[PDB]
Amino acid sequence: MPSTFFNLTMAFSLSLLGTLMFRSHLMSTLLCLEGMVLSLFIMTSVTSLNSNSMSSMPIPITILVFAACEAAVGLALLVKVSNTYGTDYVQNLNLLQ
Amino acid sequence: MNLYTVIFINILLSLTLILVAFWLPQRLPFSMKFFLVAITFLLFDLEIALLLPLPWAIQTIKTSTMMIMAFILVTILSLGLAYEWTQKGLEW
Amino acid sequence: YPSKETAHWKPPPWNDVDITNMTLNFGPQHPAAHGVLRLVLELSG
Amino acid sequence: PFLDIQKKLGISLDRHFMFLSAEQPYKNAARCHAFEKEWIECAHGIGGTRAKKECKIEFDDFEECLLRYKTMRRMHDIKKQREKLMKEGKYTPPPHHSGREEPR
Amino acid sequence: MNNYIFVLSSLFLVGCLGLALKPSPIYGGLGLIVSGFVGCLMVLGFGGSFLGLMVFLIYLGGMLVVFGYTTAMATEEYPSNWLILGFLVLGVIMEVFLICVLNYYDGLGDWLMYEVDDVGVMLEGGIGVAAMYSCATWMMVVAGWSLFAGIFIIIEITR
Amino acid sequence: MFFINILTLLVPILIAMAFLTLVERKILGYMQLRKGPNIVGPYGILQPFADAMKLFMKEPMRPLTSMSLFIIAPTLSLTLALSLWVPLPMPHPLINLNLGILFILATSSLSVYSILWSGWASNSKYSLFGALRAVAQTISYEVTMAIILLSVLLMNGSYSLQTLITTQEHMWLLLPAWPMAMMWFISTLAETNRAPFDLTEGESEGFNVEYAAGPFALFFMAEYTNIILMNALTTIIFLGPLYYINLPELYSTNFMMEALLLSSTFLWIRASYPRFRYDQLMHLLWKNFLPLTLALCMWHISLPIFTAGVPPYM
Amino acid sequence: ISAFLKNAWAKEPVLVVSFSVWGLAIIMPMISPYTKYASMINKATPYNYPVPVRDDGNMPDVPSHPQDPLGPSLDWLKNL
Amino acid sequence: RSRAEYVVTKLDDLINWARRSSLWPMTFGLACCAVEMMHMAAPRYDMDRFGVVFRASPRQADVMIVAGTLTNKMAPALRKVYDQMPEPRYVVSMGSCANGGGYYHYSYSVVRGCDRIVPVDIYVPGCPPTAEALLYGILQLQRKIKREQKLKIWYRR
Amino acid sequence: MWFEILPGLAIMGVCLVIPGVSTAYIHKFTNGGKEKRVARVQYQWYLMERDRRISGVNRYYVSKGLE
Ligand SMILES: COC1=C(OC)C(=O)C(CC=C(C)C)=C(C)C1=O
Ligand code: SF4
């Protein structure tokens, strides 16, 4: 289990480096952002499962339910952006300078 | 495993067919409704995920709380739907 | 304090606001139509 | 916590399930239910500053009921030993470790 | 079979590395759909059953699909994906690099399932997730509020 | 042995999958006052094999397009559809899965991608427009499709398809829950993109537009196998074939009869009805069916409790 | 109000039925001669071993053979 | 037998039988000879009976039946669609208006024949070529395919 | 008439019963003449493996009162 947890944790860091190093299209980011939620969901489920801690399984899912809406909001902002610029490049989001 | 055996035969059968196929014959996002629908879909999906444990939860000793909870979830989402049907939503 | 390439910035707008519908041609061969109708149609979705 | 509207109202919406020894469904105790209990009935009335130095036996154990790493080091070491000896044939696995048995 | 998990874990990192090189919006969606498949298997590998298929049922086809769905509508435009693939392979062996060192100095299956509770007819997951309705009925309410809030919140973002 | 049991359960279905197209091109025929294909072979029995060979031989033109999201899409479509027959519980199943119906629901859901991937891969306007609408109704229909099953399960007690053989030892689940059968049948018609609900790839030529020869065939095969599988799921979940533990084949014999008749029904539906409009289709699910399903979903959490009929787990 | 229900039953004949069920499911449980059984029938189903207590004495617990007339019974479940 | 030549012939035949039994046509439906084809598809003379599908898109179409005048504006399209079909493809010209120019041969907007824009394999004659005649023409395409010997030429090449 | 749609169906039916009869006899022949036991919950496996450990090396082999 410890080895698998290491992989999942680095997966989250590789997904961390991704969302903290943008490149053009935002939908990539939001997509990356989701890669973390999967890694968190997998790790939470894994330890809960090998701790036989059934009282906590509710969490693995609460994490997904909140993460899904979180993403819903994220995509509506994205659609709003390629309606105002139509190209969804993190590049044009600089009016606030 | 037993399942693996079946599945890899399943992929093999399909990859075999595509190969044979190749080897033998020798931008407007107008419909944010589209997007809207799709937003709904997950909100409903996620909701399903909350309802998916109900078969195990039926056997819960409480029962009263089970139903009280489940009925509240179904009702609040349906109201979400209702408001999708009040403004210009779900009317593509 | 405006420096070099910092004066480029000019004040933000006071109002806080800044300043073919995927036209497709209906097929002539299309089973729809009587065989020769090139209906150009600009369609928003 | 910051605003204890829960204790005041007497409600317990967030405390019943914070530790592995909390009520598990169908009374299926989790791994370590024994230890965590021994750790937290120890650190009850004794604040943290003093739940961290004298109640260290119970955490050092509960840190090994769940991580279960000191074990790994034991077993992993044992493993290597067998390997070396076996390579020179110094050690050989009995039928028990050869897949021969019928306990019932 | 042993270490079935580490292999998978390794595949999960590969998929995350693919999402991290930020490949084209939908080519990588596949990437997620791949590691989501992989994570579905791992949870299903530790005995997890419902939790495992939930992700496959919800994150896999529900979210992710909706994600690409939107990608087609917006951010479907194009301009080095093969270079990304090229460098992807670069780090794949590099994971082994890390793996080699770890193995270099410290064996799965020694333990994947920690206590089996062999005599038990009420031992799976989904009994725990169904505590949303007994003894953990606050997680259920707050999840419900989030969904109800989502319908109201999103309509303005579109409008 | 297990391998032999993989040939059976696959080939047999593939051979049957071929004979469905034939029984489609003849039942539609006589309904329309025409013999249908009888000249190749005896009574058209060799007809399905004939175009299969023509399809594979013709050039799989790769458009001036992706080359993977193009070849992954038919492989995925055939793989998921043939895969979903793995857990089906004819008499006793091949791989009995405790959470079986979630497997079937999840595997179906994955097929929507193949449509999305093929539409993006083609890189022509007809394909992308068709895929976006196609993906929309598939997942739209999935939402009622899933809730309709959750109502069923709660009266079955478990997710395992094997339990329903013991639930339906006295009466079909159509008698109770008929209101959902209809709604399962219509949703089964949408998810197999069959006629009443077959807007994609219509006379308007969606995700076969650029697909010819071998790729065309694989989805193609997939659709028809699905056509059967979904009908078969109707024939286990709602029409429960009589089960006798002493002789397991009368279960499969009646499963054979009910599956063929309900498979015949969507053939009969196709010839009989005009195709619905894209929004007409979603108007049905979100307005007409989803409120019916969500409410009848609650009735199926209440029917158990106050009728003291909570189903036995296991 | 009759019209609000007579045309809504002629046209829109789905939401009417839809709501009706929503309610009927919100009522039957409240009023029924069996609702109570569900929490019992499921409570009774014995899944986890029933651990026996020490007989300090003066107890009504069934001693020895569980068949002793003392204790809980499910004859309510029987002949239900 | 085993001498490969025989083996080859048999194989070719199978290949020919498959293409000749299932020909999926596409009907540009220029003009009227289209009405006489819809009649073939119709019940008196079922095309499907023979394995010809009533309709098909260009990607999945084995034979193109050009029914009707191929006017100069439609001439670039015909070609496109002919060029968008598979490697084993065929063209059955139908109608005097498409075999040659027909009543409109001397016009300024009519191509004098489709065989000036697409290679044509069977020419079905008649102003509204009778539906039976098209059926005869589709059947002669089937005899044309039967005779084709692609693999034996490969072997002898 | 309509007599002819039957040929095709016959070959469909026959190909939809094979699977159900096949899977249900390759089980009763690869499990010693007895249905393949269904291990749904830990306890069913235990007794299943306990039985394995009981005799021979296969579960279908069932030692009786005479043991
Ligand atoms: C008369 O106009 C025409 C059509 O629309 C009315 C067709 O659909 C078709 C297509 C019909 C068949 C036989 C596939 C043809 C041929 C045509 O020309
Ligand atoms: S040939 Fe006779 S029928 Fe065919 S198109 Fe020209 S005129 Fe119309």
PDB file of C-alpha atoms in Angstrom, chain A residues 1-8 10-12 14-15 17-23 25-39 41-42 45-46 48-52 54-62 64-69 71-80 82-83 86-89, chain E residues 5-6 9-10 12-13 16-17 19-25 28-29 32 35-36 39-40 42-43 46-48 50-52 54-55 58-59 63-64 66-67 70-71 74-75 77-78 84 98-99 102 108 111-112 114-115 122-129 131-132 136 139 142-143 146-147 150 153-154 157-159:
ATOM      1  CA  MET A   1       0.000   0.000   0.000  1.00  0.00           C
ATOM      2  CA  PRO A   2       2.722   2.602   0.912  1.00  0.00           C
ATOM      3  CA  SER A   3       4.215   2.367  -2.629  1.00  0.00           C
ATOM      4  CA  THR A   4       0.788   2.825  -4.285  1.00  0.00           C
ATOM      5  CA  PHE A   5       0.114   5.805  -1.967  1.00  0.00           C
ATOM      6  CA  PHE A   6       3.447   7.332  -3.053  1.00  0.00           C
ATOM      7  CA  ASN A   7       2.440   6.997  -6.728  1.00  0.00           C
ATOM      8  CA  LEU A   8      -1.012   8.539  -6.113  1.00  0.00           C
ATOM      9  CA  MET A  10       3.102  12.192  -6.817  1.00  0.00           C
ATOM     10  CA  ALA A  11       0.217  11.914  -9.316  1.00  0.00           C
ATOM     11  CA  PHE A  12      -1.406  14.720  -7.294  1.00  0.00           C
ATOM     12  CA  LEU A  14       2.323  16.093 -11.102  1.00  0.00           C
ATOM     13  CA  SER A  15      -1.301  17.318 -11.403  1.00  0.00           C
ATOM     14  CA  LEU A  17       2.611  21.165 -11.279  1.00  0.00           C
ATOM     15  CA  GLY A  18       0.159  21.023 -14.220  1.00  0.00           C
ATOM     16  CA  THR A  19      -2.422  23.445 -12.773  1.00  0.00           C
ATOM     17  CA  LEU A  20       0.365  25.726 -11.602  1.00  0.00           C
ATOM     18  CA  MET A  21       2.007  25.974 -15.029  1.00  0.00           C
ATOM     19  CA  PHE A  22      -0.634  27.061 -17.526  1.00  0.00           C
ATOM     20  CA  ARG A  23      -0.287  26.919 -21.288  1.00  0.00           C
ATOM     21  CA  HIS A  25      -6.332  26.799 -23.352  1.00  0.00           C
ATOM     22  CA  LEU A  26      -7.922  26.873 -19.909  1.00  0.00           C
ATOM     23  CA  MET A  27      -9.959  23.772 -20.422  1.00  0.00           C
ATOM     24  CA  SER A  28      -6.678  22.006 -20.025  1.00  0.00           C
ATOM     25  CA  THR A  29      -6.305  23.410 -16.546  1.00  0.00           C
ATOM     26  CA  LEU A  30      -9.772  22.604 -15.376  1.00  0.00           C
ATOM     27  CA  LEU A  31      -9.116  19.164 -16.790  1.00  0.00           C
ATOM     28  CA  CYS A  32      -5.925  18.926 -14.804  1.00  0.00           C
ATOM     29  CA  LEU A  33      -7.673  20.238 -11.778  1.00  0.00           C
ATOM     30  CA  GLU A  34      -9.911  17.234 -12.052  1.00  0.00           C
ATOM     31  CA  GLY A  35      -6.943  14.896 -12.225  1.00  0.00           C
ATOM     32  CA  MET A  36      -6.238  15.863  -8.633  1.00  0.00           C
ATOM     33  CA  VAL A  37      -9.768  15.156  -7.446  1.00  0.00           C
ATOM     34  CA  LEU A  38      -9.436  11.706  -8.912  1.00  0.00           C
ATOM     35  CA  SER A  39      -6.116  11.183  -7.171  1.00  0.00           C
ATOM     36  CA  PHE A  41     -10.701  10.291  -4.336  1.00  0.00           C
ATOM     37  CA  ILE A  42      -8.526   7.217  -5.067  1.00  0.00           C
ATOM     38  CA  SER A  45     -10.931   5.400  -0.839  1.00  0.00           C
ATOM     39  CA  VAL A  46      -7.732   3.287  -0.653  1.00  0.00           C
ATOM     40  CA  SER A  48     -10.433   3.973   4.157  1.00  0.00           C
ATOM     41  CA  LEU A  49     -10.574   0.500   2.532  1.00  0.00           C
ATOM     42  CA  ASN A  50      -7.381  -0.893   4.158  1.00  0.00           C
ATOM     43  CA  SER A  51      -8.228   0.696   7.542  1.00  0.00           C
ATOM     44  CA  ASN A  52     -11.609  -1.104   7.240  1.00  0.00           C
ATOM     45  CA  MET A  54     -16.420   2.048   6.856  1.00  0.00           C
ATOM     46  CA  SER A  55     -17.623   5.040   8.851  1.00  0.00           C
ATOM     47  CA  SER A  56     -15.568   7.187   6.561  1.00  0.00           C
ATOM     48  CA  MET A  57     -16.574   5.924   3.144  1.00  0.00           C
ATOM     49  CA  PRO A  58     -19.127   8.666   3.040  1.00  0.00           C
ATOM     50  CA  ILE A  59     -16.223  11.048   2.506  1.00  0.00           C
ATOM     51  CA  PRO A  60     -14.736   9.544  -0.603  1.00  0.00           C
ATOM     52  CA  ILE A  61     -18.049  10.367  -2.301  1.00  0.00           C
ATOM     53  CA  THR A  62     -18.794  13.710  -0.634  1.00  0.00           C
ATOM     54  CA  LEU A  64     -16.608  13.782  -5.627  1.00  0.00           C
ATOM     55  CA  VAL A  65     -20.061  15.408  -5.244  1.00  0.00           C
ATOM     56  CA  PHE A  66     -18.533  18.753  -4.158  1.00  0.00           C
ATOM     57  CA  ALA A  67     -15.764  18.419  -6.790  1.00  0.00           C
ATOM     58  CA  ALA A  68     -18.302  17.856  -9.590  1.00  0.00           C
ATOM     59  CA  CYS A  69     -20.236  21.061  -8.887  1.00  0.00           C
ATOM     60  CA  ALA A  71     -16.075  21.787 -11.871  1.00  0.00           C
ATOM     61  CA  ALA A  72     -19.562  22.737 -13.124  1.00  0.00           C
ATOM     62  CA  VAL A  73     -18.915  26.312 -11.888  1.00  0.00           C
ATOM     63  CA  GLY A  74     -15.433  26.175 -13.467  1.00  0.00           C
ATOM     64  CA  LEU A  75     -16.771  25.212 -16.921  1.00  0.00           C
ATOM     65  CA  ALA A  76     -19.553  27.814 -16.850  1.00  0.00           C
ATOM     66  CA  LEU A  77     -16.821  30.446 -16.303  1.00  0.00           C
ATOM     67  CA  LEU A  78     -14.934  28.816 -19.221  1.00  0.00           C
ATOM     68  CA  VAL A  79     -18.013  28.946 -21.518  1.00  0.00           C
ATOM     69  CA  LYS A  80     -18.537  32.574 -20.351  1.00  0.00           C
ATOM     70  CA  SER A  82     -15.132  31.846 -24.989  1.00  0.00           C
ATOM     71  CA  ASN A  83     -18.439  33.776 -25.389  1.00  0.00           C
ATOM     72  CA  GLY A  86     -14.307  33.016 -28.195  1.00  0.00           C
ATOM     73  CA  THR A  87     -10.837  31.543 -27.994  1.00  0.00           C
ATOM     74  CA  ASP A  88     -10.499  30.379 -24.352  1.00  0.00           C
ATOM     75  CA  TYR A  89      -6.791  31.187 -24.088  1.00  0.00           C
TER      76      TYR A  89
ATOM     77  CA  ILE E   5      -1.385  -2.662  -7.667  1.00  0.00           C
ATOM     78  CA  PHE E   6       1.997  -1.051  -8.249  1.00  0.00           C
ATOM     79  CA  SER E   9      -0.350   2.867  -9.672  1.00  0.00           C
ATOM     80  CA  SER E  10       2.417   3.437 -12.200  1.00  0.00           C
ATOM     81  CA  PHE E  12      -2.140   6.255 -12.902  1.00  0.00           C
ATOM     82  CA  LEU E  13       1.015   8.417 -12.651  1.00  0.00           C
ATOM     83  CA  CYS E  16      -1.523  12.191 -14.610  1.00  0.00           C
ATOM     84  CA  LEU E  17       1.812  13.048 -16.335  1.00  0.00           C
ATOM     85  CA  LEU E  19      -2.723  15.541 -18.129  1.00  0.00           C
ATOM     86  CA  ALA E  20       0.222  17.501 -16.710  1.00  0.00           C
ATOM     87  CA  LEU E  21       1.942  18.067 -20.016  1.00  0.00           C
ATOM     88  CA  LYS E  22      -1.389  19.630 -20.792  1.00  0.00           C
ATOM     89  CA  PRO E  23      -2.009  17.864 -24.074  1.00  0.00           C
ATOM     90  CA  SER E  24      -4.740  19.047 -26.403  1.00  0.00           C
ATOM     91  CA  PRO E  25      -7.933  19.510 -24.433  1.00  0.00           C
ATOM     92  CA  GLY E  28      -5.962  14.333 -22.659  1.00  0.00           C
ATOM     93  CA  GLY E  29      -9.524  13.908 -21.616  1.00  0.00           C
ATOM     94  CA  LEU E  32      -8.180  11.144 -17.586  1.00  0.00           C
ATOM     95  CA  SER E  35      -6.409   6.885 -15.282  1.00  0.00           C
ATOM     96  CA  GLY E  36     -10.033   6.992 -14.023  1.00  0.00           C
ATOM     97  CA  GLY E  39      -8.172   4.160 -10.354  1.00  0.00           C
ATOM     98  CA  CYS E  40     -11.501   2.358 -10.757  1.00  0.00           C
ATOM     99  CA  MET E  42      -7.199  -0.135  -7.977  1.00  0.00           C
ATOM    100  CA  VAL E  43     -10.138   0.666  -5.625  1.00  0.00           C
ATOM    101  CA  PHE E  46      -8.245  -3.355  -2.626  1.00  0.00           C
ATOM    102  CA  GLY E  47     -11.604  -5.020  -2.286  1.00  0.00           C
ATOM    103  CA  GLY E  48     -13.445  -1.792  -2.865  1.00  0.00           C
ATOM    104  CA  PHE E  50     -19.060   0.341  -4.896  1.00  0.00           C
ATOM    105  CA  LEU E  51     -16.589   3.141  -4.443  1.00  0.00           C
ATOM    106  CA  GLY E  52     -14.655   1.678  -7.282  1.00  0.00           C
ATOM    107  CA  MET E  54     -18.875   4.894  -8.559  1.00  0.00           C
ATOM    108  CA  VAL E  55     -15.965   6.738 -10.050  1.00  0.00           C
ATOM    109  CA  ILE E  58     -19.728   9.228 -12.162  1.00  0.00           C
ATOM    110  CA  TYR E  59     -16.329  10.730 -12.755  1.00  0.00           C
ATOM    111  CA  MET E  63     -18.008  14.355 -15.370  1.00  0.00           C
ATOM    112  CA  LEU E  64     -15.266  13.594 -17.772  1.00  0.00           C
ATOM    113  CA  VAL E  66     -19.353  16.325 -19.923  1.00  0.00           C
ATOM    114  CA  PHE E  67     -15.904  17.822 -19.816  1.00  0.00           C
ATOM    115  CA  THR E  70     -17.759  21.208 -23.596  1.00  0.00           C
ATOM    116  CA  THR E  71     -14.326  21.019 -25.137  1.00  0.00           C
ATOM    117  CA  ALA E  74     -15.418  25.677 -26.885  1.00  0.00           C
ATOM    118  CA  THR E  75     -11.670  25.210 -26.759  1.00  0.00           C
ATOM    119  CA  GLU E  77      -9.474  24.809 -31.604  1.00  0.00           C
ATOM    120  CA  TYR E  78      -6.013  23.699 -32.597  1.00  0.00           C
ATOM    121  CA  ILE E  84       4.354  15.688 -25.781  1.00  0.00           C
ATOM    122  CA  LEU E  98      12.611   6.510  -9.179  1.00  0.00           C
ATOM    123  CA  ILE E  99      11.236   3.024  -8.791  1.00  0.00           C
ATOM    124  CA  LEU E 102      13.247   2.840  -4.049  1.00  0.00           C
ATOM    125  CA  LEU E 108       3.700  -5.883  -2.519  1.00  0.00           C
ATOM    126  CA  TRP E 111       0.059  -6.894   2.213  1.00  0.00           C
ATOM    127  CA  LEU E 112      -2.649  -5.360   0.067  1.00  0.00           C
ATOM    128  CA  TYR E 114      -4.773  -5.663   5.807  1.00  0.00           C
ATOM    129  CA  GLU E 115      -7.283  -7.753   7.830  1.00  0.00           C
ATOM    130  CA  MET E 122     -21.874  -7.425   6.236  1.00  0.00           C
ATOM    131  CA  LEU E 123     -18.300  -6.379   5.351  1.00  0.00           C
ATOM    132  CA  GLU E 124     -18.296  -4.568   2.019  1.00  0.00           C
ATOM    133  CA  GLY E 125     -18.281  -0.946   1.038  1.00  0.00           C
ATOM    134  CA  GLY E 126     -21.609   0.620   0.299  1.00  0.00           C
ATOM    135  CA  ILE E 127     -22.607  -0.294   3.824  1.00  0.00           C
ATOM    136  CA  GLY E 128     -20.329   2.546   4.838  1.00  0.00           C
ATOM    137  CA  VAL E 129     -21.434   4.882   2.061  1.00  0.00           C
ATOM    138  CA  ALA E 131     -24.200   5.835   6.546  1.00  0.00           C
ATOM    139  CA  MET E 132     -25.402   9.008   4.802  1.00  0.00           C
ATOM    140  CA  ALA E 136     -23.613  10.336   9.126  1.00  0.00           C
ATOM    141  CA  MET E 139     -22.583  14.847   4.911  1.00  0.00           C
ATOM    142  CA  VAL E 142     -24.517  19.466   2.799  1.00  0.00           C
ATOM    143  CA  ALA E 143     -23.940  17.522  -0.459  1.00  0.00           C
ATOM    144  CA  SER E 146     -24.369  22.021  -2.902  1.00  0.00           C
ATOM    145  CA  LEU E 147     -26.355  20.383  -5.747  1.00  0.00           C
ATOM    146  CA  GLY E 150     -25.408  24.478  -8.216  1.00  0.00           C
ATOM    147  CA  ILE E 153     -25.567  29.308  -9.283  1.00  0.00           C
ATOM    148  CA  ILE E 154     -24.910  28.052 -12.849  1.00  0.00           C
ATOM    149  CA  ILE E 157     -23.109  32.168 -15.011  1.00  0.00           C
ATOM    150  CA  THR E 158     -24.675  31.186 -18.376  1.00  0.00           C
ATOM    151  CA  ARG E 159     -26.994  34.195 -18.324  1.00  0.00           C
TER     152      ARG E 159
END
